Amino acid sequence: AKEKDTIRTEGVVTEALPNATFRVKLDSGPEILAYISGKMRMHYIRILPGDRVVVEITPYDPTRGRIVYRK
Amino acid sequence: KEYLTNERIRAKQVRVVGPDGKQLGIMDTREALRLAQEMDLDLVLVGPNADPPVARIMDYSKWRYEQQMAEKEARKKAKRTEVKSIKFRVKIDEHDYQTKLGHIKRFLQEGHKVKVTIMFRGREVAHPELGERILNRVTEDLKDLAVVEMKPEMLGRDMNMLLAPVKV
Numbered sequence: 001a002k003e004k005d006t007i008r009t010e011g012v013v014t015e016a017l018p019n020a021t022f023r024v025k026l027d028s029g030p031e032i033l034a035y036i037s038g039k040m041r042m043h044y045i046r047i048l049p050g051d052r053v054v055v056e057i058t059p060y061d062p063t064r065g066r067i068v069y070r071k
Numbered sequence: 072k073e074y075l076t077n078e079r080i081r082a083k084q085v086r087v088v089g090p091d092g093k094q095l096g097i098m099d100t101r102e103a104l105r106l107a108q109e110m111d112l113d114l115v116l117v118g119p120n121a122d123p124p125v126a127r128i129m130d131y132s133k134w135r136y137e138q139q140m141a142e143k144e145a146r147k148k149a150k151r152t153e154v155k156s157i158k159f160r161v162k163i164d165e166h167d168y169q170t171k172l173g174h175i176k177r178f179l180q181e182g183h184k185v186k187v188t189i190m191f192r193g194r195e196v197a198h199p200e201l202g203e204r205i206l207n208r209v210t211e212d213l214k215d216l217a218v219v220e221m222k223p224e225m226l227g228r229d230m231n232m233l234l235a236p237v238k239v
């Protein structure tokens with residue numbers, strides 16, 4: 001089925017954490033745990049604090065996200 | 072400081088200067104040496120730049136020792152605290168920051184000027200702001216102990232600030 005409820009909202013990176021997990025403050029409002037894309041990791045695209053990435057968000061829990069796009 | 076003495080002298084006629092700052096006249100090198108011997112002291116060709124290139128009786132060795140003693144005091148106080156450098160980084164976490172701050176405080180107490188420096192990599196966008204966030208805060212914390220002499224200043228791949236202490 002792939003539930004396409006996936007919330008494609010932008011956020012500027014507040015903070016860096018390990019394993020490429022990042023508190024990113026959103027255009028939407030909150031700062032929530034959002035970890036990297038696999039794609040980005042593969043491509044070695046270094047997320048650094050102060051960047052407008054696209055944090056994909058689950059409707060089950062927005063408090064965790066997933067970074068999609070390169071800054 | 073390092074002068075030319077008794078048997079180093081080839082200046083034929085020296086405008087002789089006695090033990091204390093005397094003016095006897097223009098004596099031959101040999102004559103000057105003889106005079107020195109008479110007092111037992113050391114005749115010092117202090118200047119070949121002068122008028123009849125000049126040699127001056129003194130206890131050269133002793134004088135030098137004295138100078139060194141005096142100079143030692145000066146030389147010890149010549150360095151007398153320089154620059155301690157600390158390299159922060161754009162990310163910086165809290166305990167580390169605290170540690171750094173403590174170090175800086177210690178340095179200030181000791182008496183040294185402090186290069187509060189940041190090394191950078193890529194991503195120059197948030198860079199200066201981030202630096203400010205650290206550095207200015209740090210300065211504020213040590214406002215009781217330190218004075219800003221250099222502000223957020225660029226070196227290209229870096230950034231640098233300076234904190235001399237408050238009281239000399």
Ligand SMILES: [Mg+2]
Pocket residue numbers: 004005006007008
């Ligand atoms: Mg979607």
